[PDB]
Amino acid sequence: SKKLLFQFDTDATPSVFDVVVGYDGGADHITGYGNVTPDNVGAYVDGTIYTRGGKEKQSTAIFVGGGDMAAGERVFEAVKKRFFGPFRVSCMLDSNGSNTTAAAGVALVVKAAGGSVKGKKAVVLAGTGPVGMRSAALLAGEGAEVVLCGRKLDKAQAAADSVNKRFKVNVTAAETADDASRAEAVKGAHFVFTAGAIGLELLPQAAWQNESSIEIVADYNAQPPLGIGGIDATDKGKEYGGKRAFGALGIGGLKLKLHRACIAKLFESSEGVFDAEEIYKLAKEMAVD
Amino acid sequence: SKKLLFQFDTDATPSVFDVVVGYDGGADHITGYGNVTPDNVGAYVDGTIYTRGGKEKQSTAIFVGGGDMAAGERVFEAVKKRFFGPFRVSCMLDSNGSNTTAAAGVALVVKAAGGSVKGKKAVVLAGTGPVGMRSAALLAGEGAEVVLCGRKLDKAQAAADSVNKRFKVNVTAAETADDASRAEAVKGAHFVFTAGAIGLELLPQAAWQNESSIEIVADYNAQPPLGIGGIDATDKGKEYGGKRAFGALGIGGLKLKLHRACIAKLFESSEGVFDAEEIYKLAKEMAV
Amino acid sequence: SKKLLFQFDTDATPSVFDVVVGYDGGADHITGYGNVTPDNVGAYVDGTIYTRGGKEKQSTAIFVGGGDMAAGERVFEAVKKRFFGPFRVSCMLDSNGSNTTAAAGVALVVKAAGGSVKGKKAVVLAGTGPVGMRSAALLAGEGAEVVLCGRKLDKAQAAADSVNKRFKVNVTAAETADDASRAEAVKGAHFVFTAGAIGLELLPQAAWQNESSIEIVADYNAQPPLGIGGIDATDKGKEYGGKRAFGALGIGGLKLKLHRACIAKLFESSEGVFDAEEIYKLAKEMAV
Numbered sequence A: 001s002k003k004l005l006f007q008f009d010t011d012a013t014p015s016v017f018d019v020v021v022g023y024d025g026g027a028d029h030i031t032g033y034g035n036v037t038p039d040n041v042g043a044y045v046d047g048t049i050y051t052r053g054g055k056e057k058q059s060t061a062i063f064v065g066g067g068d069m070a071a072g073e074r075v076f077e078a079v080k081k082r083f084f085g086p087f088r089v090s091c092m093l094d095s096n097g098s099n100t101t102a103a104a105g106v107a108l109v110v111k112a113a114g115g116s117v118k119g120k121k122a123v124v125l126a127g128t129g130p131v132g133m134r135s136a137a138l139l140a141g142e143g144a145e146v147v148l149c150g151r152k153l154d155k156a157q158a159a160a161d162s163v164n165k166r167f168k169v170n171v172t173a174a175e176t177a178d179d180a181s182r183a184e185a186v187k188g189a190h191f192v193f194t195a196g197a198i199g200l201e202l203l204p205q206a207a208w209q210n211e212s213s214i215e216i217v218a219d220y221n222a223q224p225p226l227g228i229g230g231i232d233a234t235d236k237g238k239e240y241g242g243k244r245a246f247g248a249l250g251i252g253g254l255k256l257k258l259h260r261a262c263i264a265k266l267f268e269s270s271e272g273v274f275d276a277e278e279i280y281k282l283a284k285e286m287a288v289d
Numbered sequence B, C: 001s002k003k004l005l006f007q008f009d010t011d012a013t014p015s016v017f018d019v020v021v022g023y024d025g026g027a028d029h030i031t032g033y034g035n036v037t038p039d040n041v042g043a044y045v046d047g048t049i050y051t052r053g054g055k056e057k058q059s060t061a062i063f064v065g066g067g068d069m070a071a072g073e074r075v076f077e078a079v080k081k082r083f084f085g086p087f088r089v090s091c092m093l094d095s096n097g098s099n100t101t102a103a104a105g106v107a108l109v110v111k112a113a114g115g116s117v118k119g120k121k122a123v124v125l126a127g128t129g130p131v132g133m134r135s136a137a138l139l140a141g142e143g144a145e146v147v148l149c150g151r152k153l154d155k156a157q158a159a160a161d162s163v164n165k166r167f168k169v170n171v172t173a174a175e176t177a178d179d180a181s182r183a184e185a186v187k188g189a190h191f192v193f194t195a196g197a198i199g200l201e202l203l204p205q206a207a208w209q210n211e212s213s214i215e216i217v218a219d220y221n222a223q224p225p226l227g228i229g230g231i232d233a234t235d236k237g238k239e240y241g242g243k244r245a246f247g248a249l250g251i252g253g254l255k256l257k258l259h260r261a262c263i264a265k266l267f268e269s270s271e272g273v274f275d276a277e278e279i280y281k282l283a284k285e286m287a288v
């Protein structure tokens, strides 16, 4: 049968980005809905689980997206709640590319570290957005001592508490109100991620290149001024003295491949659940070829 | 040329269920619209009748759906009104699966009866919803003497009048306010259908298995408690004494195949009109 | 890579007509958005320019449509503004089919004239709609002395001013309130176009057939009464006493081929820009 992807977007209209990548992942047809909520998604899921039987079920799948991760998660939980017994299809959550971006970034850094970050300090500057929170979660699952930073302690602690509950980890929070406190926060860190909003610098070249402990720096911001000073957005494990850098476009190349590969996996079984953990497991395989 | 289905849904967004079945019926592409009304549908229909010529016209078709049958019918009449002369495409109406469900149910019962129900009493309990009304219409078109039941006579009579006007049949109405009256209403019936809302029992086992006249019972409710007591939802002509039973899942298997087959017919000509009568004609071929 | 067309419609929902012709033009998939504005289109364009690299970029393209040409143009300018450096895809603007209609009509009249209309008087009756304004734009670009007519001078002058600014030409306006003034307005004209609204006559047979200066007449109205009296909608350069005529269906045959060719070309490079000028350049090649 034809591979049908149902795209459920929490925004007013479905993401164009998610359509292109869905087709490049091998969907035969993508049918998109905007304004999806936990209340209206149940009837859409019924359409996917009562129309095809046996092996044909794996040819229908669900992708949840949109700009807001918390809204995407509520819809994704309502999808999983509507399934029962054998009445289910594979599903994926990737609101604004946040899961695939964080999975790509953490997989590349863990590989560059020699395959382990256990017991080492990892700092996620501006870690209160969805990319920073998913990065913190994946690093903490790998055993890193994670400090999730932001301009206000209350917001940073609420982000750490949310990650800790969802992923069963113990990330800690720190307030970094200014440039100087972000330079102080990376002292003694082995791994540094900048997960800031687009077009902002969070850490100059002098604040990381003179810190002996820093092994690898990773930046998710591709718009100049880049999150980390002294690197290029295309860096992908480029050496700077004894340290290695990953720029946003170096990470982005793997994120695009991973997102397409997750879509293809949705049609290989009718019971896949692709959220951060499963997406990250695939990212690590794809970083080792 | 590619088989293009245009899906016109009266609800805020198009039915996912209708998309999957449309693709499995052989549409190459489905383009769906929500909030479709008799007023905005005309311009959509123009796009289907002025873009392709000759043999290619049959490669575009229209499917009308949504949760409200009366709203679907108004859009479907506006679609038919927009065509003129040879400027037309095939169209189907199946709001909430009501046509394909009723067509499958009645086709299976008529086949199990030996191919005729003419002159025999058929009772449709909770027959005032779209499935019950379309079932009453198809049974009456087969010559059965149909009694359409509901909790209030005014609503049951309005449903019978609507069916009678649309289909040129003579269905009668009856008030059955509770279990006792439903049990009384089936006495002397040869065929009994339960078309109740989801998850409700309407006819316990003792209300039909001891009625000598009853030949076949059919239930459209798949959610326990089932409309008919003493049967399984998967029953598909299963024998109980000298009687037969069709559960909702036994009927639903044919409805899904029937719906897919109707979609494929839309692309075989530019003049098909798939409403209850034509869907039912195909359901009978598919049961034989 | 699959050829993905992103349809951005300024109306509440995307045009059905544009979907059918996009598919027949060779798009593998069409994904449509309604309510597109200069403000929300930027994020949609980002989805087209950051998802594919190298030779795959040209397999995604953009089509802008809707019933209002000015609204379409604002969306189309915002699409072009979002591109930067090599981060771009091919795009087309054809709100309500007006660019592909005007380009087909003007191309045929210019070819039939021997390849030039420079310095000759061209009159566009009811030229204030998008087809008339685009015809006046393309004719003025060909060096014709263009008079754009309408029932009220203010509306005709506003249309002329808009064309002049956008295309850098010098179209003049004239008020022709009725049949008598329209018959007076064509005196001395070598080329006449009727770009009136559907189902209206603007130029009776006696108002053009006895004027010696007139060489070719062209009508965009396909619905009787036709814009030009004494012709058939299928006429395509047909001779009427030393003069040639083009009816709306004769022009339309070129138009349907031109629109398909524009869709196919969107996937041949990532830098095509299909507005009036480029559509007209292609229409001129296809008429040969």
Ligand SMILES: NC(=O)c1ccc[n+]([C@@H]2O[C@H](COP(=O)([O-])OP(=O)(O)OC[C@H]3O[C@@H](n4cnc5c(N)ncnc54)[C@H](OP(=O)(O)O)[C@@H]3O)[C@@H](O)[C@H]2O)c1
Pocket: A096, A097, A098, A101, A126, A127, A128, A129, A130, A131, A132, A149, A150, A151, A152, A155, A156, A195, A196, A197, A198, A199, A200, A220, A221, A222, A248, A252, A255
């Ligand atoms: N390539 C891709 O596919 C892709 C996909 C998704 C995201 N991205 C990129 O990844 C990065 C992170 O994405 P996101 O969605 O998680 O980011 P985000 O939510 O927009 O912002 C992350 C955090 O940045 C901090 N911030 C905002 N303005 C600031 C300022 N003026 N100074 C200091 N800090 C500031 C905020 O933290 P506090 O308020 O707590 O300080 C905010 O929570 C972005 O640059 C984005 O473009 C790329």
Ligand SMILES: NC(=O)c1ccc[n+]([C@@H]2O[C@H](COP(=O)([O-])OP(=O)(O)OC[C@H]3O[C@@H](n4cnc5c(N)ncnc54)[C@H](OP(=O)(O)O)[C@@H]3O)[C@@H](O)[C@H]2O)c1
Pocket: B096, B097, B098, B101, B126, B127, B128, B129, B130, B131, B132, B149, B150, B151, B152, B155, B156, B195, B196, B197, B198, B199, B200, B220, B221, B222, B248, B251, B252, B255
């Ligand atoms: N397999 C499929 O694909 C498919 C497709 C469509 C429908 N169905 C099923 O078919 C059945 C009929 O559908 P429908 O849409 O026609 O049903 P409906 O409109 O929801 O309900 C039918 C009638 O049931 C009666 N009713 C409601 N609540 C009741 C109560 N508490 N006690 C007694 N009667 C009650 C009402 O009649 P009165 O008020 O007149 O008494 C009502 O008009 C449903 O069970 C539905 O799930 C299946």
Ligand SMILES: NC(=O)c1ccc[n+]([C@@H]2O[C@H](COP(=O)([O-])OP(=O)(O)OC[C@H]3O[C@@H](n4cnc5c(N)ncnc54)[C@H](OP(=O)(O)O)[C@@H]3O)[C@@H](O)[C@H]2O)c1
Pocket: C096, C097, C098, C101, C126, C127, C128, C129, C130, C131, C132, C149, C150, C151, C152, C155, C156, C195, C196, C197, C198, C199, C200, C220, C221, C222, C252, C255
């Ligand atoms: N085959 C195709 O793909 C296709 C595509 C697009 C257009 N067309 C055809 O091309 C023609 C022109 O299209 P359009 O969108 O540019 O036209 P339009 O905007 O609907 O009308 C053009 C002009 O006609 C004049 N008009 C309207 N009612 C009139 C009346 N009662 N008497 C005299 N003049 C009147 C108006 O000018 P004033 O108010 O200034 O007098 C109006 O601005 C139409 O016939 C249309 O059907 C064909």
